[PDB]
Amino acid sequence: GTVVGIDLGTTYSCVGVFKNGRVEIIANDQGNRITPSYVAFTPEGERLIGDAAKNQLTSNPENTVFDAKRLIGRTWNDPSVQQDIKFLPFKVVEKKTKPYIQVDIGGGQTKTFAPEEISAMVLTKMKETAEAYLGKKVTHAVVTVPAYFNDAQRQATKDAGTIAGLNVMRIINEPTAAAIAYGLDKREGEKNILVFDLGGGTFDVSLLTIDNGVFEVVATNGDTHLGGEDFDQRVMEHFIKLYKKKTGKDVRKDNRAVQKLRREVEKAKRALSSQHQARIEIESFYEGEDFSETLTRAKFEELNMDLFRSTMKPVQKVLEDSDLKKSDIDEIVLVGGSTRIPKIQQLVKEFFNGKEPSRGINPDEAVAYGAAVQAGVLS
Amino acid sequence: NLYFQSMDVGTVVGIDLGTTYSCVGVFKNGRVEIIANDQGNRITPSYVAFTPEGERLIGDAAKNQLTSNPENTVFDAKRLIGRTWNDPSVQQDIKFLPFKVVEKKTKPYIQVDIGGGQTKTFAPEEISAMVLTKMKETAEAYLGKKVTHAVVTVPAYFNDAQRQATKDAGTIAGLNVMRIINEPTAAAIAYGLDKGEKNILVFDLGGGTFDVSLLTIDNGVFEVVATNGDTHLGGEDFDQRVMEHFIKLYKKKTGKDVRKDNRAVQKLRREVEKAKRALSSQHQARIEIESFYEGEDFSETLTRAKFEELNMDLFRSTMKPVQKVLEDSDLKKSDIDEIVLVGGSTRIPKIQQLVKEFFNGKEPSRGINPDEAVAYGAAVQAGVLSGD
Ligand SMILES: Nc1ncnc2c1ncn2[C@@H]1O[C@H](COP(=O)(O)OP(=O)(O)O)[C@@H](O)[C@H]1O
Ligand SMILES: Nc1ncnc2c1ncn2[C@@H]1O[C@H](COP(=O)(O)OP(=O)(O)O)[C@@H](O)[C@H]1O
Ligand SMILES: [Ca+2]
Ligand SMILES: [Ca+2]
Ligand SMILES: [Ca+2]
Numbered sequence: 001g002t003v004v005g006i007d008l009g010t011t012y013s014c015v016g017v018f019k020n021g022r023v024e025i026i027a028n029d030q031g032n033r034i035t036p037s038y039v040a041f042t043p044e045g046e047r048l049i050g051d052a053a054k055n056q057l058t059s060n061p062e063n064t065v066f067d068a069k070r071l072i073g074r075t076w077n078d079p080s081v082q083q084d085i086k087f088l089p090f091k092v093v094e095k096k097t098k099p100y101i102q103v104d105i106g107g108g109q110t111k112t113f114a115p116e117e118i119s120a121m122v123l124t125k126m127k128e129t130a131e132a133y134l135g136k137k138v139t140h141a142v143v144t145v146p147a148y149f150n151d152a153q154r155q156a157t158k159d160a161g162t163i164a165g166l167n168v169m170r171i172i173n174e175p176t177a178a179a180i181a182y183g184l185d186k187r188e189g190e191k192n193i194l195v196f197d198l199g200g201g202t203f204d205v206s207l208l209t210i211d212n213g214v215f216e217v218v219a220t221n222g223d224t225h226l227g228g229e230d231f232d233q234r235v236m237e238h239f240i241k242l243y244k245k246k247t248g249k250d251v252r253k254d255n256r257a258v259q260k261l262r263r264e265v266e267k268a269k270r271a272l273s274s275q276h277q278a279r280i281e282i283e284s285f286y287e288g289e290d291f292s293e294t295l296t297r298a299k300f301e302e303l304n305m306d307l308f309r310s311t312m313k314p315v316q317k318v319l320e321d322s323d324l325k326k327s328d329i330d331e332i333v334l335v336g337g338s339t340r341i342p343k344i345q346q347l348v349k350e351f352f353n354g355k356e357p358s359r360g361i362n363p364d365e366a367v368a369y370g371a372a373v374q375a376g377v378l379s
Numbered sequence: 380n381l382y383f384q385s386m387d388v389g390t391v392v393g394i395d396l397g398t399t400y401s402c403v404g405v406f407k408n409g410r411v412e413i414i415a416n417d418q419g420n421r422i423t424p425s426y427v428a429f430t431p432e433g434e435r436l437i438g439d440a441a442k443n444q445l446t447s448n449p450e451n452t453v454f455d456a457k458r459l460i461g462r463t464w465n466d467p468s469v470q471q472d473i474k475f476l477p478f479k480v481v482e483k484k485t486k487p488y489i490q491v492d493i494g495g496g497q498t499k500t501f502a503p504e505e506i507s508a509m510v511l512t513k514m515k516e517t518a519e520a521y522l523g524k525k526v527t528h529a530v531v532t533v534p535a536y537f538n539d540a541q542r543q544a545t546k547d548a549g550t551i552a553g554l555n556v557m558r559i560i561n562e563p564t565a566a567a568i569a570y571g572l573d574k575g576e577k578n579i580l581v582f583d584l585g586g587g588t589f590d591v592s593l594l595t596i597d598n599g600v601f602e603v604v605a606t607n608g609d610t611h612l613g614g615e616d617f618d619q620r621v622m623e624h625f626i627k628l629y630k631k632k633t634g635k636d637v638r639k640d641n642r643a644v645q646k647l648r649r650e651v652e653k654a655k656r657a658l659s660s661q662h663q664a665r666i667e668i669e670s671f672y673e674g675e676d677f678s679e680t681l682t683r684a685k686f687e688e689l690n691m692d693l694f695r696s697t698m699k700p701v702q703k704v705l706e707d708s709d710l711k712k713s714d715i716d717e718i719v720l721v722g723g724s725t726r727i728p729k730i731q732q733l734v735k736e737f738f739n740g741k742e743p744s745r746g747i748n749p750d751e752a753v754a755y756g757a758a759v760q761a762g763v764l765s766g767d
């Protein structure tokens with residue numbers, strides 16, 4: 001019927017549709033165009049998806065599930081799983097040599113879910129937000145995945161669709177989707193495209209060569225665990241030790257203070273993508289005392305200096321591996337929420353000797369945008 | 380002979396001017412009171428830092444900023460104080476200090492950028508002066524009075540040039556140092572070992588130095604009979620073994636080599652250090668650093684057994700100088716009446732266990748906080764000079 005395009009992202013997902021000549025990115029029933037890729041199990045037996053799952057994360061660390069994409073379609077033995085496991089606050093147990101996620105569901109009950117079951121529940125949220133908008137049922141979808149995903153990861157993403165009641169007609173590589181979003185599907189000779197994708201917890205760089213609807217991912221690279229969250233973390237550290245210094249108080253063991261801080265740091269960072277200062281204020285922050293500081297853009301870039309510079313290495317590396325030089329790159333496509341950071345943009349611009357990157361698509365929505373275009377072609 | 384405090388000028392302080400930390404105490408109201416600093420810490424890092432912006436930092440704030448400001452953060456000044464340039468100790472040390480040490484008038488001087496385009500050159504005793512000034516001020520905030528006189532401790536092996544240079548450092552700081560006393564003697568005094576003829580072994584293992592001293596006491600007369608040790612072995616080395624294990628392990632679990640990233644290394648060091656301290660009173664320590672390297676996190680458990688294994692050879696080698704002081708002082712291990720263990724690293728259970736086994740089960744002395752014992756003893760002598 002009407003096929004949806006879904007960006008099923010690490011930290012956020014996005015659903016779009018092609019209806020009456022254009023791509024419509026669909027707002028969820030809480031008013032947002034992207035939805036958190038979170039699922040929570042409450043004590044009272046209630047299953048929450050999205051924003052509701054995420055606002056309930058501090059109070060429910062063990063049964064708020066996220067980052068399912070990091071596990072999806074992998075075996076227990078994957079070195080990547082072996083590391084990730086140590087940092088997830090929910091239980092992951094080995095079963096049939098695959099990661100399974102184990103949560104309490106209330107009434108004394110435990111369940112284990114395959115990562116793809118958890119992703120399934122995210123897809124069910126996207127499905128329902130699509131159907132509400134379209135006024136009708138949705139059964140088919142184009143879902144994107146990272147370019148370095150192997151068959152078992154792709155198949156597992158397809159299985160998620162099925163668990164969710166979607167037929168995932170096509171799986172499309174995220175950089176190709178971003179490429180399609182910017183009209184690089186237009187038939188206009190051979191082009192070498194660098195897609196620089198920077199989300200909340202992951203950095204992917206992809207060199208794609210395009211040739212009249214023939215897309216090839218030549219080389220891929222990145223930092224599997226570098227993202228927007230890390231930039232929040234540099235700033236958190238700065239402020240926690242500044243708070244100690246002024247008030248004598250250390251807040252690190254107080255999960256309530258810490259996460260109120262994280263929440264305001266997150267708001268501050270976002271704002272510092274289009275202002276040079278943001279006031280971080282919290283009332284009754286710690287033992288009755290308030291918190292007030294202004295963060296400058298200068299201080300934000302200073303505290304993240306090297307994380308920002310180190311995004312250049314995977315770029316140089318993908319040009320080496322595809323036997324190209326920076327002069328060979330015809331479009332630079334910047335996608336992922338964190339590419340809104342002017343310094344990131346500036347460091348990329350500078351790297352390519354003044355070339356401006358393509359413009360006119362929303363970086364938070366680009367991958368879903370591309371998927372939706374192809375959904376509309378597939379029909 | 381006797382010092383009389385007034386209403387404006389307070390009692391005599393005892394100071395442990397140590398290699399990596401210092402501690403100041405006082406005898407007041409019949410007890411030794413070990414004075415906490417403005418940070419709430421009962422020991423203070425023996426560190427001075429000179430920021431770009433012209434601020435001189437001392438203690439914890441100097442140390443807090445050692446990675447970002449390596450060339451202008453000074454420490455280990457005790458390693459150079461009262462020594463000639465030609466001293467083989469100095470020639471070795473300067474190779475390893477991250478701040479500049481030039482020769483002036485045949486003596487080592489420390490040269491730092493003091494802000495505003497200027498450099499200054501400080502004698503090691505000027506740097507210890509600054510540490511002593513922080514200790515002075517800590518005392519004065521506690522006493523609500525000025526502090527003008529002190530008893531300061533030094534290693535048994537210090538010579539006259541080294542003792543004089545410690546006295547001069549007090550002098551630069553405004554402290555009349557009434558008495559210099561040996562650290563192990565100070566440690567003996569804190570355990571009451573001054574109140575027939577006893578033989579005392581003092582095992583002092585700090586952050587960077589290991590000092591063993593054999594001491595006789597006869598009717599309140601102390602004599603340092605033999606001294607030995609490893610002048611560069613201390614708790615910092617035990618961190619170094621654990622650091623190496625994790626840099627290696629991290630490379631092979633994740634591919635990532637972090638060795639030349641000083642921010643990551645410093646971050647690991649802080650957590651290894653905290654871990655170590657915790658393994659002196661529990662059997663496992665978590666080491667968790669968020670965004671350790673290129674956004675990737677770090678998470679590992681260090682067990683006490685793993686900690687002992689990594690340092691096995693280092694711990695056992697602390698027995699060789701204990702044997703040498705016995706040989707050199709012509710005593711058998713059975714001639715030792717008292718074992719005193721002091722220094723923060725003697726909190727390590729395996730170190731306690733090795734010393735105890737070396738003396739066929741003999742228990743060490745116990746009533747005093749091992750990183751405060753040197754100060755405590757100094758503080759007690761401070762009291763006898765002030766009339767209590
Ligand atoms: N205005 C902004 N400035 C800086 N970072 C932003 C902004 N908006 C979103 N981000 C960051 O984008 C990250 C999420 O990227 P996104 O692509 O939406 O999700 P995913 O992590 O699933 O790829 C978050 O860390 C968020 O803070
Ligand atoms: N609980 C503990 N367990 C193990 N080592 C400790 C503990 N507390 C302190 N230390 C070690 O003691 C060393 C410092 O000893 P100290 O006598 O305080 O100073 P100095 O080095 O100036 O003699 C440090 O290496 C520190 O890690
Ligand atoms: Ca994304
Ligand atoms: Ca050493
Ligand atoms: Ca990260």
Ligand SMILES: [Ca+2]
Pocket residue numbers: 397398585721722723750753
């Ligand atoms: Ca000591």
